[PDB]
Amino acid sequence: LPISMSDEGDSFLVKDSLGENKIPKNPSKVVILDLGILDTFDALKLNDKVVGVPAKNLPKYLQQFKNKPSVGGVQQVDFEAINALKPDLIIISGRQSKFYDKLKEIAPTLFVGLDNANFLSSFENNVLSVAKLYGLEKEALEKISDIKNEIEKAKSIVDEDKKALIILTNSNKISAFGPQSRFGIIHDVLGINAVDENIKVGTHGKSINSEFILEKNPDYIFVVDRNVILGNKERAQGILDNALVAKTKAAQNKKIIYLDPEYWYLASGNGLESLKTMILEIKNAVK
Residue 160 is labelled as binding a ligand: yes
Residue 146 is labelled as binding a ligand: yes
CA 241, 246, 250, 253 dihedral sign is positive
* C-alpha span between 224 and 96 (Å, rounded): 22
* C-alpha span between 172 and 251 (Å, rounded): 20
DSSP string across 96-143: GGGGHHHHHHHS-EEE----TTSHHHHHHHHHHHHHHHHT-HHHHHHH
CB 16 within 8 A of CB 110: yes
Residue 142 is labelled as binding a ligand: yes
Residue 265 is labelled as binding a ligand: yes
Residue 190's Cβ-side half-sphere holds a number of Cα atoms within 13 Å equal to: 29
Q: Where are the beta strands (DSSP E) in 181-270?
A: 193-194, 206-208, 220-225, 256-259
Q: Which residues belong to the annotated binding site?
A: 142, 146, 160, 187, 197, 204, 265
Q: Which residues belong to the annotated binding site for Zn(2+)?
A: 142, 146, 160, 187, 197
Q: Which residues belong to the annotated binding site for Fe(3+)?
A: 204, 265
